[PDB]
C-alpha cells in the first residue's frame, strides 16, 4: 500500500542499478573507475592505489568520452569528439598521454575522424584506421607507417567492416587482429564495389533548407554481396623508406567456387593463425590453420589441417560458427559444436585430425567457453536444474572429463541463477556477475581454491529504495506441446490474486535462437505496466528459440514466419485457459523481428488478440539484409526458396487486420530495418480499407533511442494500450 513503479520512474530512470566494471590488467590486478578516478585494485588483498586522478584532465580543453590504457601501463589513450555511426561504428578524435613524463604527446598525432584505434596486446604499439586505410605507430610520438593505400569511402574497407559485416557477422566495426605478442597485424579487406545502395532522406536541424539523401551499401536478400580478402603484415620490419609488405592468405578453393564470407579469425600462437570461412549458403563452413613460413616469408595452410563443419537440418552455428580455444602450444583446441542429437557441447580437436572427442554431453547446451588453463577448462552452461533460461559457471578437469565442478550454482541459489564471468590474465582470479532473479550481485574469487574473496557490489543501496515501492513479481515456468516443454515468463502485478481477471500483454521477439524467457532481473516498461497498471506481461520461447538444442532451433529452417508465429498464438490460448487472464483483453507487441511476428499474428485472423503494436517491423524478407535473411531462408529464386519468401509477407494478410486495433511505428532514418518495410505495410492496409494508426519518428533510427524520442514513444504506446484495455 505504498507507491508504484511509475512511467516516470522508468523514463526518468529514478531507480538505478549499480555495476562493477573492472578491466583486468595483470594476473592479479585490475582497474576500476570511481567518482572519476581510475584506481588499481589488488585482487588478493583488496587494497587499492590511485592510478590517475580526475584532476589530471580538468584543462584538457575537450570533453573526454573514454579512456584506454596501453598494456604496458606507460601510456593512456583519450577519446573525444565521439560521433556515432551504426550499431558499433563511430568516429572520434584522439590524444595520447605519457604517464611517465606526465604529459600529452603533441606531435605526430592521430587524425581527427579516426574510425578505429587499438593498442597492441603487449607494449604500446598502435594501429588505427583513417579514411579506410590502416596505419601503425610503433611509438606514440614517432610518425605512423601507412599499410594500405586502396581505402575508399563506401567502396574499399581496410581494417574495418562494411555495414553487413558489422551488423550480421563480426558484431564489431573493427576488422583487424594483432598477434599475441604484437609482431603481426592481420586484417580484412572488404570490397563493396557492386553492392547496391539503400537510400533515405535525412532532415537535420530545421535550419537545413534541402533534405539530405543518406546512401549506404547494403545487400538485401538475393542481391550482390561484398567480397573479402585477408592479409597479414609484419610490424617489426617496417621501413619508412619502403611501403610495407602484406601477405594475402587466399581462401579455401572449396569456398572460391562461389560467394563466401570470412566469419572468424583467432590467433593460436605467435606464428599460427586460424580462419573460418562460410559459404553464402550457410550450411557448410571451413576452418584453415596457418603457419608463418620463415623461408618464403609467407603463410601456408596445409589442406590436411583443414576442418569442415556442416548441417542438413539448418545452418552452421547459433548465428555463425563458434570460435576455437587453442592450447598453449597450439596443436589442439576446444570448440563448441553441435553433437549427434543436436545439443551444443565442447569438442576437442587435434589440428591435423578430422575427428574430435566431445568432453561434455547432456540434454542441455554450453553457452560459451570462458577460460583455458593447462589442466582446467572453464565454461558457462544452462545445465543446472534443467532450465534453459538459467546460466552458471562450470570447470572441467582436463585429465579427467567426469570431474566437472559447478562454481556458482549454490553460491546463492535463491537470488542468483544467471551468471557471467570475467577472468584475470591467467585465470588466477575471476569476477562473477549475477543478474537475476535477485538484484545484481558482483563477487570476486581466487581460482587456486575456488575461494570467494570479497563482495564487490550488492545493490543494497537500491534495495532500501525498492521496498518503499510495490514491485511486480516474475514467474518462470513451462507448458507442454507435443511432449516437449516450451518455457515462458510472466511479470505479475503486485498482490497478484490468482482468481481475478487481469488483462494480458504478450511481449514478443521470437527470432531464430532467441530466448525471451530467462531468470534476469529487469527494470523496464513491463515493470511499469504490471506495477502501476496491473497488466500481466508475458513472453514465450516457442519453436526456433535457442539453448534447447537443434530440434527446437532448426524447426523453422527455410520457413520463417510460420511456426514461431503459430506458437505465439498457441501460448496466448494456453494463457487464457489458465483462468486468471481476461479473455477479451489480450494484446501483443514487439520490435524488429518481434514487430514482424506481432504483425503476422494480428494478420492471422485467430481472434485471440484485441490489439498490437509493431515497432520497426520487418514486413517481407526480400527487404532485409542478405547475411541474416539467407542464413535461414536461402535465396529468393524459383530453384531455391522464393515460394516461402512470397508466402510469408505481412502485406498478404492486410485483409484480416479489420478485426484488430493496430499501431505501427518506425524511425525515418532506420538503416537496419528500412522505413520501406513499414511504408509497404501501411499502403497494403490502406488499399484494403483497414483502419489503424501509424507514427513516424523524424530522423530516428532502429533504436528510437535518442533521449526525447525514447520518452515520447513509450508514452505514446502506454496511452494506446491503456485505451485499448479500457484502463483509467
Amino acid at each position: 500500500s505504498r507507491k508504484t513503479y511509475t512511467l516516470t520512474d522508468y523514463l526518468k530512470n529514478t531507480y538505478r542499478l549499480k555495476l562493477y566494471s573492472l578491466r583486468w590488467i595483470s594476473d592479479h590486478e585490475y582497474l576500476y573507475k570511481q567518482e572519476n578516478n581510475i584506481l588499481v585494485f589488488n585482487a588478493e588483498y583488496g587494497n587499492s592505489s590511485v592510478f590517475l586522478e580526475n584532476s589530471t584532465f580538468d584543462e584538457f580543453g575537450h570533453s573526454i568520452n573514454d579512456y584506454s590504457i596501453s598494456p604496458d601501463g606507460q601510456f593512456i589513450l583519450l577519446e573525444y569528439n565521439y560521433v556515432k555511426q551504426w550499431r558499433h561504428s563511430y568516429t572520434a578524435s584522439y590524444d595520447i598521454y605519457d604517464l611517465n613524463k606526465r604529459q600529452l604527446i603533441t606531435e605526430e598525432r592521430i587524425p581527427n575522424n579516426t574510425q578505429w584505434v587499438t593498442w597492441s596486446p603487449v607494449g604500446h604499439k598502435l594501429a588505427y584506421v583513417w579514411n579506410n586505410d590502416i596505419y601503425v605507430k610503433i611509438e606514440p610520438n614517432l610518425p605512423s607507417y601507412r599499410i594500405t593505400w586502396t581505402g575508399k569511402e563506401d567502396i574499399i574497407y581496410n581494417g574495418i567492416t562494411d555495414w553487413v559485416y558489422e551488423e550480421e557477422v563480426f558484431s564489431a566495426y573493427s576488422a583487424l587482429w594483432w598477434s599475441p605478442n604484437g609482431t603481426f597485424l592481420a586484417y580484412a579487406q572488404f570490397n563493396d564495389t557492386e553492392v547496391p545502395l539503400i537510400e533515405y532522406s535525412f532532415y537535420s536541424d530545421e535550419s537545413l533548407q534541402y533534405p539530405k539523401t543518406v546512401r549506404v551499401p547494403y545487400p538485401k536478400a538475393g542481391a550482390v554481396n561484398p567480397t573479402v580478402k585477408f592479409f597479414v603484415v609484419n610490424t617489426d620490419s617496417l621501413s619508412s623508406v619502403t611501403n610495407a609488405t602484406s601477405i594475402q592468405i587466399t581462401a579455401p578453393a572449396s569456398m572460391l567456387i562461389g560467394d563466401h564470407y570470412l566469419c572468424d579469425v583467432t590467433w593460436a600462437t605467435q606464428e599460427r593463425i586460424s580462419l573460418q570461412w562460410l559459404r553464402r549458403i550457410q550450411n557448410y563452413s571451413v576452418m584453415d590453420i596457418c603457419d608463418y613460413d620463415e623461408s618464403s616469408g609467407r603463410w601456408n595452410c596445409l589442406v590436411a589441417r583443414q576442418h569442415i563443419e556442416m548441417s542438413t537440418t539448418g545452418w552452421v552455428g547459433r548465428f555463425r560458427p563458434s570460435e576455437p580455444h587453442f592450447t598453449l602450444d597450439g596443436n589442439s583446441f576446444y570448440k563448441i559444436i553441435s553433437n549427434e542429437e543436436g545439443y551444443r557441447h565442447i569438442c576437442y580437436f587435434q589440428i591435423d585430425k578430422k575427428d574430435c572427442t566431445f568432453i561434455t554431453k547432456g540434454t542441455w547446451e554450453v553457452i560459451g567457453i570462458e577460460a583455458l588453463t593447462s589442466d582446467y577448462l572453464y565454461y558457462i552452461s544452462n545445465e543446472y536444474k534443467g532450465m534453459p533460461g538459467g546460466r552458471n559457471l562450470y570447470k572441467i578437469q582436463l585429465s579427467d572429463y567426469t570431474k566437472v565442478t559447478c562454481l556458482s550454482c549454490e553460491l546463492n541459489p535463491e537470488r542468483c541463477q544467471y551468471y557471467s564471468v570475467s577472468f584475470s590474465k591467467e585465470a588466477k582470479y575471476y569476477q562473477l556477475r549475477c543478474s537475476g532473479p535477485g538484484l545484481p550481485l558482483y563477487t570476486l574469487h581466487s581460482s587456486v581454491n575456488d575461494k570467494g574473496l570479497r563482495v564487490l557490489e550488492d545493490n543494497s543501496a537500491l534495495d532500501k529504495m525498492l521496498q518503499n515501492v510495490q514491485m511486480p513479481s516474475k514467474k518462470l515456468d513451462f507448458i507442454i506441446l507435443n511432449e516437449t516443454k516450451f518455457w515462458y515468463q510472466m511479470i505479475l502485478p503486485p498482490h497478484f490474486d490468482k482468481s481475478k481477471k487481469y488483462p494480458l500483454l504478450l511481449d514478443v521477439y521470437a527470432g531464430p535462437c532467441s530466448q525471451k524467457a530467462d531468470t534476469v532481473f529487469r527494470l523496464n516498461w513491463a515493470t511499469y505496466l504490471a506495477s502501476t497498471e496491473n497488466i500481466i506481461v508475458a513472453s514465450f520461447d516457442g519453436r526456433g528459440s535457442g539453448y534447447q538444442g537443434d530440434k527446437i532451433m532448426h524447426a523453422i529452417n527455410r520457413r520463417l514466419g510460420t511456426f514461431e508465429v503459430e506458437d505465439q498464438i498457441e501460448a496466448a490460448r494456453q494463457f487464457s485457459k489458465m483462468g486468471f487472464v481476461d479473455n477479451k483483453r489480450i494484446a501483443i507487441w514487439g520490435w524488429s523481428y518481434g514487430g514482424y511476428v506481432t504483425s503476422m499474428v494480428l494478420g492471422s485472423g485467430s481472434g485471440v488478440f484485441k490489439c498490437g503494436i509493431a515497432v520497426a517491423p520487418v514486413s517481407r524478407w526480400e527487404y532485409y539484409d542478405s547475411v541474416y535473411t539467407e542464413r535461414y531462408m536461402g535465396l529468393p529464386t524459383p530453384e531455391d526458396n522464393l515460394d516461402h519468401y512470397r508466402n510469408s509477407t505481412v502485406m498478404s494478410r492486410a485483409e484480416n487486420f479489420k478485426q484488430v486495433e493496430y499501431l505501427l511505428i518506425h524511425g525515418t532514418a532506420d538503416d537496419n530495418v528500412h522505413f520501406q518495410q513499414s511504408a509497404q505495410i501501411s499502403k497494403a492496409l490502406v488499399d484494403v480499407g483497414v483502419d489503424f494508426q501509424a507514427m513516424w519518428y523524424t530522423d530516428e533510427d532502429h533504436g528510437i533511442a535518442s533521449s526525447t524520442a525514447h520518452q515520447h514513444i513509450y508514452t505514446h504506446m502506454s496511452h494506446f494500450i491503456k485505451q485499448c484495455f479500457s484502463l483509467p
Binding site: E168, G511, S514, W591, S592, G703, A705
Partner: peptide, 6 residues
C-alpha cells in the same frame, strides 16, 4: 538483427 535494450 538483434533485440534492442534500455
Amino acid at each position: 538483427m538483434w533485440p534492442v535494450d534500455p
